[PDB]
Amino acid sequence: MGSSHHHHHHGSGLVPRGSASMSDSEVNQEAKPEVKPEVKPETHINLKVSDGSSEIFFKIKKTTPLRRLMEAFAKRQGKEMDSLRFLYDGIRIQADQTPEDLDMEDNDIIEAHREQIGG
């Protein structure tokens, strides 16, 4: 909670109730706004290989942040998603919140499925 100089002999204190202090100043909001910059056609392309042969990449509906994935695992342990937030140098999460190294390109994720047959 905090720290302050204090000296007292062992035993019952004088009046450990009259005084008061607060250290919880955390502030958060639900359903925060998000910013997604516009890009040119086919600007973002991901390439991957799976099934021991070949894998094709396609676009997805809207954008799914890593926080979404984190939330699924968070509820597993009974942790509150809202209680956990990702901030960088006091900067609110943005579209580029993803790792700089990955540069939002060729996401390291693979899937194996052949539901659709054709060609």
**Residue whose C-alpha is closest to residue 70's, from 50, 97, 45:** 97
**Residue whose C-alpha is closest to residue 16's, from 5, 8, 24, 28:** 8
Separation CA 90–CA 101 (nearest Å): 21
**Residue whose C-alpha is closest to residue 43's, from 64, 59, 63, 66:** 59
**What is the gyration radius of the CA atoms in the chain, in angstroms?**
25
Query: Looking at residue 77, what DSSP letter applies?
Result: T
- Residue 2 corresponds to which tokens in the numbers above? 């905090």
Helix (H, G, I), strand (E, B) or coil at 88: strand
Single-letter amino acid code for the residue at 50:
S
Separation CA 61–CA 87 (nearest Å): 25
